[PDB]
Design an enzyme around this catalytic site. Structure first.
Site, PDB file in Angstrom:
ATOM      1  N   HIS A 274      47.436  33.204  37.893  1.00 29.16           N
ATOM      2  CA  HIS A 274      48.438  34.054  38.546  1.00 29.16           C
ATOM      3  C   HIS A 274      49.858  33.528  38.324  1.00 29.16           C
ATOM      4  O   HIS A 274      50.452  32.880  39.189  1.00 29.16           O
ATOM      5  CB  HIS A 274      48.129  34.237  40.041  1.00 29.16           C
ATOM      6  CG  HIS A 274      47.052  35.241  40.313  1.00 29.16           C
ATOM      7  ND1 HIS A 274      45.812  34.895  40.803  1.00 29.16           N
ATOM      8  CD2 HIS A 274      47.032  36.586  40.158  1.00 29.16           C
ATOM      9  CE1 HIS A 274      45.076  35.982  40.944  1.00 29.16           C
ATOM     10  NE2 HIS A 274      45.793  37.023  40.559  1.00 29.16           N
TER      11      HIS A 274
ATOM     12  N   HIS B 125      50.274  36.590  33.314  1.00 28.55           N
ATOM     13  CA  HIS B 125      49.306  37.559  33.825  1.00 28.55           C
ATOM     14  C   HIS B 125      49.948  38.926  34.039  1.00 28.55           C
ATOM     15  O   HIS B 125      49.425  39.932  33.574  1.00 28.55           O
ATOM     16  CB  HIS B 125      48.672  37.076  35.130  1.00 28.55           C
ATOM     17  CG  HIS B 125      47.761  38.080  35.757  1.00 28.55           C
ATOM     18  ND1 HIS B 125      46.805  38.759  35.034  1.00 28.55           N
ATOM     19  CD2 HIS B 125      47.661  38.527  37.031  1.00 28.55           C
ATOM     20  CE1 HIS B 125      46.154  39.582  35.835  1.00 28.55           C
ATOM     21  NE2 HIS B 125      46.651  39.459  37.053  1.00 28.55           N
TER      22      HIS B 125
ATOM     23  N   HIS C  73      53.288  42.985  40.564  1.00 29.53           N
ATOM     24  CA  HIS C  73      52.035  43.093  41.334  1.00 29.53           C
ATOM     25  C   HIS C  73      51.454  41.790  41.905  1.00 29.53           C
ATOM     26  O   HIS C  73      50.664  41.850  42.837  1.00 29.53           O
ATOM     27  CB  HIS C  73      50.949  43.864  40.548  1.00 29.53           C
ATOM     28  CG  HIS C  73      50.162  43.028  39.587  1.00 29.53           C
ATOM     29  ND1 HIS C  73      50.743  42.309  38.565  1.00 29.53           N
ATOM     30  CD2 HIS C  73      48.829  42.825  39.478  1.00 29.53           C
ATOM     31  CE1 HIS C  73      49.801  41.684  37.880  1.00 29.53           C
ATOM     32  NE2 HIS C  73      48.632  41.979  38.415  1.00 29.53           N
ATOM     33  N   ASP C  74      51.821  40.636  41.347  1.00 27.68           N
ATOM     34  CA  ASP C  74      51.391  39.335  41.883  1.00 27.68           C
ATOM     35  C   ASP C  74      52.559  38.348  42.015  1.00 27.68           C
ATOM     36  O   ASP C  74      52.390  37.152  41.782  1.00 27.68           O
ATOM     37  CB  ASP C  74      50.286  38.731  40.996  1.00 27.68           C
ATOM     38  CG  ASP C  74      48.989  39.518  41.042  1.00 27.68           C
ATOM     39  OD1 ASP C  74      48.558  39.929  42.138  1.00 27.68           O
ATOM     40  OD2 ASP C  74      48.381  39.712  39.969  1.00 27.68           O
TER      41      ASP C  74
ATOM     42  N   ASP D 178      44.894  45.438  35.905  1.00 26.42           N
ATOM     43  CA  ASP D 178      44.805  44.156  36.615  1.00 26.42           C
ATOM     44  C   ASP D 178      43.617  43.285  36.167  1.00 26.42           C
ATOM     45  O   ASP D 178      43.739  42.056  36.143  1.00 26.42           O
ATOM     46  CB  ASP D 178      44.742  44.388  38.137  1.00 26.42           C
ATOM     47  CG  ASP D 178      44.945  43.109  38.948  1.00 26.42           C
ATOM     48  OD1 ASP D 178      45.828  42.296  38.593  1.00 26.42           O
ATOM     49  OD2 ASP D 178      44.226  42.922  39.956  1.00 26.42           O
TER      50      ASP D 178
HETATM   51  C1  LIG Z   1      41.913  38.469  40.176  1.00 26.13           C
HETATM   52  C2  LIG Z   1      40.442  38.097  40.017  1.00 26.13           C
HETATM   53  C3  LIG Z   1      39.572  38.991  40.880  1.00 26.13           C
HETATM   54  C4  LIG Z   1      39.236  40.277  40.472  1.00 26.13           C
HETATM   55  C5  LIG Z   1      38.393  41.025  41.278  1.00 26.13           C
HETATM   56  O1  LIG Z   1      38.142  42.261  40.742  1.00 26.13           O
HETATM   57  C6  LIG Z   1      37.240  43.147  41.419  1.00 26.13           C
HETATM   58  C7  LIG Z   1      37.823  44.542  41.067  1.00 26.13           C
HETATM   59  F1  LIG Z   1      39.165  44.558  41.288  1.00 26.13           F
HETATM   60  F2  LIG Z   1      37.662  44.788  39.740  1.00 26.13           F
HETATM   61  C8  LIG Z   1      37.909  40.478  42.459  1.00 26.13           C
HETATM   62  C9  LIG Z   1      38.314  39.199  42.784  1.00 26.13           C
HETATM   63  N1  LIG Z   1      39.133  38.453  42.026  1.00 26.13           N
HETATM   64  N2  LIG Z   1      40.024  38.168  38.597  1.00 26.13           N
HETATM   65  C10 LIG Z   1      40.697  38.713  37.535  1.00 26.13           C
HETATM   66  N3  LIG Z   1      40.073  38.595  36.389  1.00 26.13           N
HETATM   67  C11 LIG Z   1      38.902  37.932  36.720  1.00 26.13           C
HETATM   68  C12 LIG Z   1      37.797  37.510  35.959  1.00 26.13           C
HETATM   69  N4  LIG Z   1      37.679  37.714  34.642  1.00 26.13           N
HETATM   70  N5  LIG Z   1      36.781  36.877  36.584  1.00 26.13           N
HETATM   71  C13 LIG Z   1      36.895  36.699  37.895  1.00 26.13           C
HETATM   72 CL1  LIG Z   1      35.546  35.900  38.642  1.00 26.13          CL
HETATM   73  N6  LIG Z   1      37.868  37.043  38.729  1.00 26.13           N
HETATM   74  C14 LIG Z   1      38.856  37.664  38.075  1.00 26.13           C
HETATM   75 MG   LIG Z   2      46.506  40.484  43.209  1.00 27.07          MG
HETATM   76 ZN   LIG Z   3      46.749  40.754  39.710  1.00 23.83          ZN
END
Ligand SMILES: C[C@@H](c1cc(OCC(F)F)ccn1)n1cnc2c(N)nc(Cl)nc21
Ligand SMILES: [Mg+2]
Ligand SMILES: [Zn+2]
EC number: 3.1.4.53
Length: 338
Positions: A75, A79, A115-116, A245
């Site tokens: 973050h 990103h 956004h972040d 995102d």
């Molecule tokens: C930022 C974070 C994230 C994303 C989430 O997405 C669920 C929905 F929004 F798709 C839920 C929780 N955290 N996030 C962004 N890319 C990600 C990735 N490749 N793997 C994981 Cl384990 N978390 C990620």
């Molecule tokens: Mg966020």
């Molecule tokens: Zn984000």
């Protein structure tokens, strides 16, 4: 305009999906958002729309980028530049160009950029459990999502050198402001399936019925009338910002793996502090001493990504992303080797 060589070449093929964001990050020395932002904003004609000068936009990009944390692996400004790139790429798509209006393009690009902002490398649940001042301020409800947009508008409007919204009409600004606020707040985890269900039911299923019935000239207006309604345009904006995102599983393999490590390192760093300070472990599977990153990425793709991009792909048609999604999913599987 006044752009060095390596960084100018690093932004060569920036309309293309296979775009090396880390070469931009390296070349720009943790300042890629101002360089990629100025070119994308100039391509989308955003200061012409907003009635701002380039100097106001440069100052706006630097001050928000400055408030992104270099210390955070994932973050950081790179990103949100990567998310800006994915957002711009989706806006360029034919479905999105002819569905959404020029004001939505500007809302999405701004929303992605901020956004972040001032992300503390931590989740909302951590900030509630750790007793953070933002958890008290935002009442344990969309803590970071509220903070990002709020700070972004605190930084923008509070100074005249940063205020990109200053020369607009007051009524146009409120419309654009609500669009940004909606899309920044749409990035929260807890409302994932809420927003994805709405997108399949409101857009894809009715659109599938229209294509099933036929494809006449009169029927084409009914499809345009349905999607371009303010309610459905908001639904598409939410699906666009959410897909942007988390577009890193749909990137060229080298980028996917880099993104997976960075977010994995964040979640481990949180897990260390949760153990250290004596907090409840909200994310137990993401520990540096037990987590298989290749398995976690498979589970991540299965639980959230695959259904989301299935709906989004059906709408926009993103063959390269789906082709990259399948390739990366097979690579993560391939690391068993026993
Ligand atoms: C930022 C974070 C994230 C994303 C989430 O997405 C669920 C929905 F929004 F798709 C839920 C929780 N955290 N996030 C962004 N890319 C990600 C990735 N490749 N793997 C994981 Cl384990 N978390 C990620
Ligand atoms: Mg966020
Ligand atoms: Zn984000």
């Amino acid at each position: 305009d006044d752009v060095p060589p390596r960084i100018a070449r690093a932004m060569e093929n920036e309309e293309y999906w296979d775009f090396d964001i880390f070469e931009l990050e390296a070349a720009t020395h943790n300042r890629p958002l101002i360089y990629l932002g100025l070119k994308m904003f100039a391509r989308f004609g955003i200061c012409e729309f907003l009635h701002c000068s380039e100097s106001t936009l440069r100052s706006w990009l630097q001050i928000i980028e400055a408030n992104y944390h270099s210390s955070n692996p994932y973050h950081n400004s790179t990103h949100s530049a990567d998310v800006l790139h994915a957002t711009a790429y989706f806006l360029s798509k034919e479905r999105i160009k002819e569905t959404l209006d020029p004001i939505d393009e500007v809302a999405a690009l701004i929303a992605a950029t901020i956004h972040d902002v001032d992300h503390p490398g931590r989740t909302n649940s951590f900030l509630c459990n750790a007793g953070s001042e933002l958890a008290i301020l935002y009442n344990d409800t969309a803590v970071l999502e509220s903070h990002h947009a709020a700070l972004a508008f605190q930084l923008t409007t509070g100074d005249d050198k940063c205020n990109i919204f200053k020369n607009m009409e007051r009524n146009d600004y409120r419309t654009l402001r609500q669009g940004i606020i909606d899309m920044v707040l749409a990035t929260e985890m807890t409302k994932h399936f809420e927003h994805v269900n709405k997108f399949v039911n409101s857009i894809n299923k009715p659109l599938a019925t229209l294509e099933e019935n036929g494809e006449t000239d009169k029927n084409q207006e009914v499809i345009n009338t349905m999607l371009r309604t303010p309610e459905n345009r908001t639904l598409i904006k939410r699906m666009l910002i959410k897909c942007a995102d988390v577009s890193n599983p749909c990137r060229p393999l080298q980028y996917c793996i880099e993104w997976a490590a960075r977010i994995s390192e964040e979640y481990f760093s949180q897990t260390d502090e949760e153990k250290q300070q004596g907090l409840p472990v909200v994310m137990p599977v993401f520990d540096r001493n037990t987590c298989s990153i290749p398995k976690s990425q498979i589970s991540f793709i299965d639980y959230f990504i695959t259904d989301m991009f299935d709906a989004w792909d059906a709408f926009v048609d993103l063959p390269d992303l789906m082709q990259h999604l399948d390739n990366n999913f097979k690579y993560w599987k391939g690391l068993d080797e026993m």
